[PDB]
Amino acid sequence: WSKIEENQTVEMTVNLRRICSRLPWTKKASKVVRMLKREIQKHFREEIGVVVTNDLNNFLYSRGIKKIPNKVRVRVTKETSLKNAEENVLKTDLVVVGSFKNLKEVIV
RNA sequence: CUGCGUGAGCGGGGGUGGAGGGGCGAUAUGUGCAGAUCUUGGUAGCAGUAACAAGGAAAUGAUUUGCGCUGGACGAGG
């Protein structure tokens, strides 16, 4: 396994078609942002909250309210909570790509 | 809580209560309740059950984006 924290930025691919199956086709887009937040908390074995950028949010709604695009490449980073002062959050952003081939997990 | 009476009922003791209450003889009665699909008021079980609501999101939301189709005027009525 690989659970990663302490001031870094990881890059990662998520399979939306996979994590959103078992959901009715009228509800895959209406609940897609909430299914993605659960799977980042599982990937890193965390408990803190997740924050989604306005470009990630806009990209998950770009096939209408019935379709849900296939894959997404994201960049995760941990920093301080803007609502409390002692807790952290996982902040996620969008990375634009033309292919998903040979793309592994990266750390900088 | 306790004594007496075959019984209907009648006494005493300790708390509570804060102003009146009885015995005996004759007399006047709107004079004794378990029931009337009785009258009025209060309360259980059923049961936290049936039914109804939880509208797409973005730490923030005068900014960004997703969905629905009545929209604007005169009279009656308010």
UniProtKB/Swiss-Prot annotation:
CDD domains for this protein: Ribosomal_L31e
Superkingdom to which the source organism belongs: Eukaryota
Annotated Pfam families: Ribosomal_L31e (PF01198)
Keywords: Ribonucleoprotein, Ribosomal protein
Tagged with keyword Membrane: no
Entry-linked InterPro entries: Ribosomal_eL31, Ribosomal_eL31_dom_sf
CC terms in the record's Gene Ontology section: ribonucleoprotein complex; ribosome
One GO MF term attached to the UniProt entry: structural constituent of ribosome
Record has tRNA-binding as a keyword: no
Gene3D superfamilies in the cross-refs: 3.10.440.10
Family membership: Belongs to the eukaryotic ribosomal protein eL31 family.
Protein name: Large ribosomal subunit protein eL31
Origin species: Encephalitozoon cuniculi (strain GB-M1)
